[PDB]
Amino acid sequence: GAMEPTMDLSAFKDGLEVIVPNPITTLVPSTGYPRPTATWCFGDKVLETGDRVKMKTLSAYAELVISPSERSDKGIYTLKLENRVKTISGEIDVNVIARPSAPKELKFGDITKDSVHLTWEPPDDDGGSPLTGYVVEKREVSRKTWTKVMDFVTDLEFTVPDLVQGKEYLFRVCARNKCGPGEPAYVDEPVNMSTPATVPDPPENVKWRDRTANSIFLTWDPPKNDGGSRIKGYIVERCPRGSDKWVACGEPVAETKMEVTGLEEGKWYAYRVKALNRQGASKPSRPTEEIQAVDTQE
């Protein structure tokens, strides 16, 4: 008398879902007289015990354990039971998922009195599972606990409300899976609602045209950073060659142009401009070359 090997795979009809690094455990009830021999294969490769691969056989079952699990362990595992009657083979499709990576290119902007707009980009790896959403958290730089602003955000942007003036905030955004949230992405610098205004930046492109014995016409470019306050005007200054004293030309003007006059013929002058706002005056622009006051010739 004898009996064929039989295996019970009814526990894997849906499949096997494993979150890294939890072990992949496949226990299959086996029957058969004589007792069948177990053979484990991952893909077209025969598995044998060693490090992460561990196998055991009892009279009632054959079991395969892969610990710790990796993403590369995903595939179809095959169990062959063999006695003198017959050789049977069954397959188990194992999906090994993990948690998402961190959102990319987290930026902040559009800072109002009570809101901060945040935009990000999808993470590189979703962890072998569809992204369920994004998680938005905040924390004032004085406080030590992160509070969740919103979860399951299905967009690449979010406007954080209910922010208080005079406070600095940190922001981090995570990506979510069925396994849970992943590594967070933080903001490059803290976000400050207050932002006390500063003095402007120097003008940038001071150039000259229409140079005579007593006059010159100067043009410059407005600075990029106004310092948080409106550019009230500009101040043009002058330095003769034989001195290191910068003298102001005329009076403050609201335009990016000025015609300096009163120049003495035969002298060489350099010129520089400052940008004015409520907080004061900027640092002077890069001074121009020393230009001789003389009328055109030939």
Q: What is the token pair recorded at 192?
A: 């400050």
Q: In sequence order, what are the residues at sequence separation of 6 or more whose Cβ sits closer than 8 angstroms to the Cβ of residue 160?
A: 115, 116, 117, 118, 136, 138, 149, 169, 171
- Return the CATH class of domain 3-97: mainly beta
Q: What is the token pair recorded at 158?
A: 């979010």
Q: Which CATH architecture has domain 207-293?
A: Sandwich (2.60)
Pairing of strands 87-97, 16-19: parallel
- Peptide bond between residue 100 and the one before it cis (omega within 30 degrees of 0): no
Q: Which amino acid is at 5?
A: P
CATH number of the structural domain 104-192: 2.60.40.10
Residue 148 β-bridge partners: 137
- How far apart, in whole angstroms, are the C-alpha atoms of residue 37 and residue 209? 97
- Method by which the model was determined: X-ray
- How far apart, in whole angstroms, are the C-alpha atoms of residue 251 and residue 272? 14
Extended strands (E) in 70-167:
75-82, 87-97, 104-109, 116-121, 133-140, 147-153, 157-160
Neighbours of 121 (CB within 10 A): 12
Q: What is the token pair recorded at 97?
A: 């998922």
Pairing of strands 24-33, 45-46: unpaired
Which residue, among 248, 297, 242, has the nearest Cα to 276 in the 3D structure?
248
Ranges of each domain in the chain: 3-97, 104-192, 207-293
Q: What angle do CA 216, 250, 205 make, to 5 degrees?
A: 50
Decide: 179 and 127 in contact? Cβ < 8 Å.
yes
